Amino acid sequence: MIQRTPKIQVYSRHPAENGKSNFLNCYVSGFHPSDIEVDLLKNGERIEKVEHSDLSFSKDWSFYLLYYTEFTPTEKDEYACRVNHVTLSQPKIVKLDRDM
Protein backbone atom coordinates (compact mmCIF):
# COMPACT_ATOMS: atom_id res chain seq x y z
CA MET A 1 0.00 0.00 0.00
CA ILE A 2 1.05 3.57 -0.61
CA GLN A 3 -0.40 6.81 0.56
CA ARG A 4 0.64 10.23 -0.70
CA THR A 5 -0.51 13.70 0.36
CA PRO A 6 -1.94 15.82 -2.43
CA LYS A 7 -0.15 18.93 -3.61
CA ILE A 8 -2.68 21.77 -3.92
CA GLN A 9 -2.44 24.77 -6.26
CA VAL A 10 -5.06 27.49 -6.52
CA TYR A 11 -5.02 29.96 -9.41
CA SER A 12 -7.12 31.86 -11.90
CA ARG A 13 -7.21 31.69 -15.68
CA HIS A 14 -9.01 33.37 -18.58
CA PRO A 15 -9.79 31.04 -21.48
CA ALA A 16 -8.12 32.55 -24.53
CA GLU A 17 -11.27 32.08 -26.66
CA ASN A 18 -13.39 34.01 -24.12
CA GLY A 19 -11.05 36.38 -22.31
CA LYS A 20 -13.62 38.30 -20.29
CA SER A 21 -14.49 35.10 -18.46
CA ASN A 22 -12.37 34.03 -15.47
CA PHE A 23 -12.00 30.61 -13.85
CA LEU A 24 -11.08 29.69 -10.31
CA ASN A 25 -8.95 26.51 -10.36
CA CYS A 26 -7.90 24.05 -7.70
CA TYR A 27 -5.40 21.53 -8.99
CA VAL A 28 -4.93 18.67 -6.53
CA SER A 29 -2.05 16.42 -7.61
CA GLY A 30 -0.14 13.24 -6.95
CA PHE A 31 -2.44 11.75 -4.31
CA HIS A 32 -3.21 8.24 -3.15
CA PRO A 33 -5.67 6.76 -2.27
CA SER A 34 -8.07 8.44 -4.66
CA ASP A 35 -10.71 9.04 -1.95
CA ILE A 36 -10.84 12.80 -1.50
CA GLU A 37 -13.04 15.78 -0.70
CA VAL A 38 -12.43 19.07 -2.51
CA ASP A 39 -14.34 22.35 -2.41
CA LEU A 40 -13.88 25.83 -3.69
CA LEU A 41 -14.65 28.51 -1.07
CA LYS A 42 -15.86 32.12 -1.43
CA ASN A 43 -15.40 34.04 1.82
CA GLY A 44 -15.13 30.71 3.67
CA GLU A 45 -18.39 29.31 2.28
CA ARG A 46 -18.46 26.31 -0.02
CA ILE A 47 -19.25 27.13 -3.69
CA GLU A 48 -22.03 24.68 -4.65
CA LYS A 49 -21.90 25.11 -8.41
CA VAL A 50 -18.50 23.92 -9.67
CA GLU A 51 -18.88 23.17 -13.34
CA HIS A 52 -15.70 21.16 -14.00
CA SER A 53 -14.19 18.23 -12.05
CA ASP A 54 -11.59 16.36 -14.10
CA LEU A 55 -9.93 13.28 -12.53
CA SER A 56 -7.10 11.27 -13.99
CA PHE A 57 -4.32 8.95 -12.89
CA SER A 58 -0.72 8.33 -13.95
CA LYS A 59 1.33 5.20 -14.38
CA ASP A 60 2.06 4.75 -10.70
CA TRP A 61 -1.67 5.25 -9.74
CA SER A 62 -1.15 8.72 -8.45
CA PHE A 63 -4.35 10.71 -8.97
CA TYR A 64 -4.79 14.22 -10.35
CA LEU A 65 -7.87 16.40 -10.01
CA LEU A 66 -8.63 19.73 -11.65
CA TYR A 67 -11.63 21.30 -10.00
CA TYR A 68 -12.65 24.60 -11.53
CA THR A 69 -15.47 26.95 -12.31
CA GLU A 70 -16.30 30.39 -13.63
CA PHE A 71 -16.05 33.20 -11.08
CA THR A 72 -16.15 36.97 -10.91
CA PRO A 73 -13.61 38.06 -8.28
CA THR A 74 -13.72 41.45 -6.58
CA GLU A 75 -10.86 42.84 -4.48
CA LYS A 76 -12.86 42.33 -1.24
CA ASP A 77 -13.74 38.66 -1.82
CA GLU A 78 -11.41 35.89 -0.68
CA TYR A 79 -11.28 32.58 -2.60
CA ALA A 80 -9.72 29.29 -1.60
CA CYS A 81 -9.69 25.54 -2.06
CA ARG A 82 -10.36 23.15 0.81
CA VAL A 83 -9.12 19.58 0.62
CA ASN A 84 -9.62 16.63 2.93
CA HIS A 85 -7.80 13.36 2.47
CA VAL A 86 -6.70 10.48 4.71
CA THR A 87 -3.14 11.87 4.77
CA LEU A 88 -4.40 15.18 6.16
CA SER A 89 -5.24 15.26 9.86
CA GLN A 90 -7.19 18.48 9.32
CA PRO A 91 -8.66 19.93 6.15
CA LYS A 92 -6.10 21.89 4.18
CA ILE A 93 -7.18 25.36 2.98
CA VAL A 94 -5.11 27.01 0.26
CA LYS A 95 -5.96 30.58 -0.65
CA LEU A 96 -6.13 32.18 -4.05
CA ASP A 97 -3.51 34.84 -3.54
CA ARG A 98 -4.04 38.32 -4.91
CA ASP A 99 -2.53 38.22 -8.40
CA MET A 100 -2.63 34.43 -8.92
Numbering used by the authors: 0 to 99
What is written in the article reporting this PDB entry?
The Trp95Leu mutant was crystallised according to the protocol used for the Trp60Val β2-m mutant, yielding crystals belonging to the same space group and with the same crystal packing observed for the β2-m DE loop mutants, as recently reported. Trp95Leu mutant crystals diffracted to a resolution of 1.57 Å. In accordance with the single residue mutation, the Trp95Leu mutant crystal structure is very similar to that of wild-type β2-m (R.S.M.D. 0.55 Å, calculated over 97 Cα pairs), and the mutated Leu95 side chain matches the location of the Trp95 indole ring in the wild-type protein. On the other hand, the cavity created by residues Ser11, Asn21, Leu23, Phe70, Pro72 and Tyr78, which perfectly fits the bulky side chain of Trp95 in wild-type β2-m, is only half filled by Leu95. Given the hydrophobicity of the cavity, however, no water molecules appear to fill the gaps, leaving the cavity partially empty. Such a condition is unfavourable for protein stability and, together with the loss of an H bond, certainly contributes to the lower stability observed for the Trp95Leu mutant. Consequently, the presence of the mutated Leu95 residue is reflected by increased flexibility of the downstream residues. The whole 96-99 segment displays poor electron density, and could only be modelled with 0.5 occupancy. In the Trp95Leu isoform the electron density for the DE loop is of poor quality; such a loop was modelled in two alternative conformations, with residual electron density suggesting an even higher number of conformations. The presence of Leu at site 95 induces a destabilization of 1.0 kcal/mol, with a Cm shift from 1.9 to 1.65 M GdnHCl.
